[PDB]
Scaffold this active site. Sequence first.
Site, mmCIF file in Angstrom:
data_model
loop_
_atom_site.group_PDB
_atom_site.id
_atom_site.type_symbol
_atom_site.label_atom_id
_atom_site.label_comp_id
_atom_site.label_asym_id
_atom_site.label_seq_id
_atom_site.Cartn_x
_atom_site.Cartn_y
_atom_site.Cartn_z
ATOM 1 N N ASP A 160 0.819 -1.217 0.000
ATOM 2 C CA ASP A 160 0.000 0.000 0.000
ATOM 3 C C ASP A 160 0.847 1.258 0.000
ATOM 4 O O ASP A 160 0.536 2.221 -0.702
ATOM 5 C CB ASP A 160 -0.962 0.044 1.196
ATOM 6 C CG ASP A 160 -2.070 -0.992 1.106
ATOM 7 O OD1 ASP A 160 -2.724 -1.254 2.142
ATOM 8 O OD2 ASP A 160 -2.300 -1.528 0.001
ATOM 9 N N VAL A 162 3.784 1.631 -1.241
ATOM 10 C CA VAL A 162 4.317 1.776 -2.588
ATOM 11 C C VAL A 162 3.259 2.378 -3.508
ATOM 12 O O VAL A 162 3.540 3.315 -4.249
ATOM 13 C CB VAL A 162 4.828 0.430 -3.156
ATOM 14 C CG1 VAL A 162 5.384 0.628 -4.564
ATOM 15 C CG2 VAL A 162 5.907 -0.155 -2.256
ATOM 16 N N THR A 163 2.039 1.855 -3.449
ATOM 17 C CA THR A 163 0.952 2.377 -4.283
ATOM 18 C C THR A 163 0.695 3.876 -4.042
ATOM 19 O O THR A 163 0.613 4.670 -4.990
ATOM 20 C CB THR A 163 -0.377 1.624 -4.041
ATOM 21 O OG1 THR A 163 -0.133 0.212 -4.001
ATOM 22 C CG2 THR A 163 -1.356 1.925 -5.166
ATOM 23 N N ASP A 197 3.599 0.680 -10.173
ATOM 24 C CA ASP A 197 2.557 -0.341 -10.292
ATOM 25 C C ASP A 197 3.182 -1.725 -10.459
ATOM 26 O O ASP A 197 2.673 -2.705 -9.919
ATOM 27 C CB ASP A 197 1.584 -0.043 -11.449
ATOM 28 C CG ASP A 197 0.368 0.799 -11.010
ATOM 29 O OD1 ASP A 197 -0.787 0.394 -11.305
ATOM 30 O OD2 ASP A 197 0.567 1.878 -10.402
ATOM 31 N N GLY A 201 2.715 -4.766 -7.646
ATOM 32 C CA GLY A 201 2.183 -6.017 -8.151
ATOM 33 C C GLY A 201 3.096 -7.165 -7.739
ATOM 34 O O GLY A 201 2.638 -8.242 -7.318
ATOM 35 N N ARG A 205 2.112 -9.936 -4.765
ATOM 36 C CA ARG A 205 2.232 -11.355 -5.065
ATOM 37 C C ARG A 205 3.176 -12.044 -4.062
ATOM 38 O O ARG A 205 2.925 -13.161 -3.592
ATOM 39 C CB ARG A 205 2.744 -11.513 -6.494
ATOM 40 C CG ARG A 205 2.195 -12.698 -7.221
ATOM 41 C CD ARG A 205 2.413 -12.598 -8.741
ATOM 42 N NE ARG A 205 1.811 -11.420 -9.375
ATOM 43 C CZ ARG A 205 2.508 -10.357 -9.789
ATOM 44 N NH1 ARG A 205 3.830 -10.336 -9.649
ATOM 45 N NH2 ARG A 205 1.892 -9.319 -10.357
ATOM 46 N N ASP A 218 -5.796 -0.104 -5.486
ATOM 47 C CA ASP A 218 -5.257 -0.070 -6.847
ATOM 48 C C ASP A 218 -6.210 0.592 -7.854
ATOM 49 O O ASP A 218 -5.795 1.478 -8.598
ATOM 50 C CB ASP A 218 -4.906 -1.493 -7.311
ATOM 51 C CG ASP A 218 -4.515 -1.559 -8.792
ATOM 52 O OD1 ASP A 218 -3.368 -1.181 -9.141
ATOM 53 O OD2 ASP A 218 -5.356 -2.011 -9.605
ATOM 54 N N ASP A 222 -5.605 4.577 -9.105
ATOM 55 C CA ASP A 222 -5.393 4.647 -10.550
ATOM 56 C C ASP A 222 -6.282 5.749 -11.109
ATOM 57 O O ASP A 222 -5.836 6.530 -11.961
ATOM 58 C CB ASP A 222 -5.681 3.307 -11.237
ATOM 59 C CG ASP A 222 -4.478 2.366 -11.205
ATOM 60 O OD1 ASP A 222 -3.420 2.793 -10.691
ATOM 61 O OD2 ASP A 222 -4.583 1.202 -11.663
HETATM 62 MG MG LIG Z 1 -2.889 -0.332 -11.062
#
Ligand SMILES: [Mg+2]
Length: 335
Positions: A160, A162-163, A197, A201, A205, A218, A222
């Site tokens: 989160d 990082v996002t 992104d 991701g 994972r 996400d 976005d």
């Molecule tokens: Mg995205």
Amino acid sequence: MRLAYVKNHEIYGEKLLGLTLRERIEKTLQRAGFDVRFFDELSLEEAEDYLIILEPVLILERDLLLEGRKILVSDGFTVGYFFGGDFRTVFDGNLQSSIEKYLSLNNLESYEIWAIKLSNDNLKTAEKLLLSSLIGSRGLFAAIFLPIARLLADWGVSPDAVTVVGTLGVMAGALIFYPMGQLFWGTVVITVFVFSDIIDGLMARLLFREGPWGAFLDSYLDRVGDSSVFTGIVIWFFLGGANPTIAILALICLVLSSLVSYSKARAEGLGLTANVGIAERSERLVVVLVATGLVGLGIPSWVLLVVLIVLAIASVVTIFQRVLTVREQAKAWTA
Ligand SMILES: [Mg+2]
């Protein structure tokens, strides 16, 4: 309800890429739909599927699909057993004995999965392997960011974070640099933080966070990102850019962009689906960024005008595609 018994071991307590090996095998099996019981000595419960893991193992396979009875093996290693309900009528309370009896009773073939047996010496290797399992056909662009994901996983950084950080970066390029009139540098700023992104991701994972919150965030961030990009363009060309017609086209694309996203989100709320259309979010982003960057390098602004027009038209037919298919689904569902 599916049950998976994994035997407790000394090495499961070691932390690898942010989780413990214990946590990693537990979450892996949970994603495969098993409730996990760690045991020093087995106490069997009434259930359908029985998955018995003995040797300490790191399962690298993403989707594990277990259909029918079989023996689970990886490169000659026997990592664990999958027994049916029949094993309830065999097991008398001793582990090794009940296993060999069931092996004498049933002839089962061996199914190959991707996994590595844990040892103190090969920990580095496992780590290497686990990172490579993250790529999943995404290509070289995914692979080059693996050391960053490794670094962030070890540091205790959440996906989160990082996002959010990525989104603040896009906003900084779009809402600061663009209104200043720096289209080139604003674009490289946006461009640099858009790849965050691929990082989240990889981490999502790696750290097992696939949940509804992750997906929500996400999607949402976005939306915030794309809206900010058009917003900066609109502002700049209405003021210092001195091009109202480019600004109007940019504003129209902003709205059209929002409408294309909202149709799909709203359809899914209704239980329907709307993943279609010529215009895709990343593709829309790319052409806009390339044109704007070019204009920031001194290219005639009509290049951006043309691209905005084409993007407006592509968004319109996409909206039509989505609205049409949800209609077919809805009307078919009522009848
Ligand atoms: Mg995205």
